[PDB]
Amino acid sequence: KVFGRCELAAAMKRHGLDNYRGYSLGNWVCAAKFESNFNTQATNRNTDGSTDYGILQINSRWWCNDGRTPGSRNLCNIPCSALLSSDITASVNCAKKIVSDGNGMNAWVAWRNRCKGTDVQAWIRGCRL
Template sequence: MKIWVLLLLVAAVSTKRFTKCELVRTLKAAGMDDFFSVKHLLYLIFTYLIGMYTEHYGIFQINNRRWCSDGKFPGKKDCPFTCNQLFSLQNSIDCAKIIVQKLGMTPWKGWRYECWGQDVSKYVAGCGV
């Protein structure tokens, strides 16, 4: 019981909440604009982050079939992380960079069907970018 409480406490302490603009600045500082427009990434995050998928991990909802390993789909994965490691923002950023380098934004179906070619500047409005 004490270990469970300790794990919950550690998880609660290590969780970082971002305002929209803090997240924009964090993604820009991590070089995400060099890979794909931060405003499109924010669209993806704000539209699809809310537990829509059970087989997608981290802030960018990265799929476990090709990109990360959770034991359900054997084989080599393109990102060097387990799926649970994608709950680290830095690991998610690093994996998203790999995905965008290989395939652009097309692996994210929501982006492909609803965002591609749309004006999504409202997602970074007021953040000075």
């Protein structure tokens, strides 16, 4: 599913991401834009053989099981395919774990490089939230 901007903002808010670990909703929407272009089916192979899945490009080395990332963990206790669903619940639940891991949203390289310190409130402008 390719979410609309406000559509994703609303789903993220409903699932409790607005100000989760202190990060405003616009940060999460911005991260999703640059990680996946709001596409739940996005996948990207990493150099180490792991793969990133879903709207927030969650990695199989630590967070989900894809059956082809030797020595990996599955800290969110889910198949990586669950992160590609039109229902963002699994992605949100797992993202909450990631952002709590100590480095905040810096875990998302695209967020650090394209969102951090910018006017992220712009990402939810106009939305009926």
